[PDB]
Design a binder for this molecule. Structure first.
Ligand SMILES: CC(C)CN(C[C@@H](O)[C@H](Cc1ccccc1)NC(=O)O[C@H]1CO[C@H]2OCC[C@H]21)S(=O)(=O)c1ccc(N)cc1
Lengths: 99, 99
């Protein structure tokens, strides 16, 4: 559906077997969540934004469930003060900006 | 106009009599640009980003032109790696998420 921006655009997500809230975030190329146990192998990744940079772990082809949409996506795990749904996932649910 | 998210949602902005590019950023509460001279008084502000917390100058009631739209908004100046158009500006121009 359509979402205004008077409040933060938080949505409920399931990943991979856990429930989280995350921010629909058009300024993020990538999807990043707080420390949680994703299963399997990961590759080290550094990313930077406002206030500096973190070391994150990149998990590929992680099932994510967002609203009614199931997708399989790359997911970074590392310190973020908020879970963020990035363009890599939003494109897959057909999310656009409009004004 | 509708904007897909296959690419970063950059827009051209006029702010403080200067032209720049910025990201339409639904994950940002506030609007923040790289160091530039905005005229007048300002307040020190803490933000925290992915890597934050950090030191920024808050300028109130700054003229901003984006996509035809002229708004007057709070604008933060500080060492961000991309200029960011936050929800405080996006709501004024009527920007929504859709899917
Ligand atoms: C700064 C952007 C260019 C990129 N950021 C996404 C952005 O939407 C963050 C996303 C974000 C949101 C909250 C907390 C941490 C990160 N928002 C943000 O920094 O907003 C700040 C300005 O307004 C305030 O509102 C919230 C924080 C403040 S980011 O989280 O740092 C980021 C950086 C690198 C990658 N690869 C992916 C994401």
């Amino acid at each position: 559906p359509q979402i205004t921006l008077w409040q933060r655009p938080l949505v409920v997500v399931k990943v991979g077997g856990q429930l989280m809230e995350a921010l629909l975030d058009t300024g993020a190329d990538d999807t990043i969540f707080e420390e949680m146990n994703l299963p399997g192998r990961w590759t080290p990744k550094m990313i930077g934004g406002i206030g500096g940079f973190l070391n994150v772990r990149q998990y590929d082809q992680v099932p994510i469930e967002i609203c009614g949409h199931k997708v399989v996506s790359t997911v970074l795990i590392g310190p973020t003060p908020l879970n963020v749904i990035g363009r890599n996932v939003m494109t897959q649910i057909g999310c656009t900006l409009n004004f």
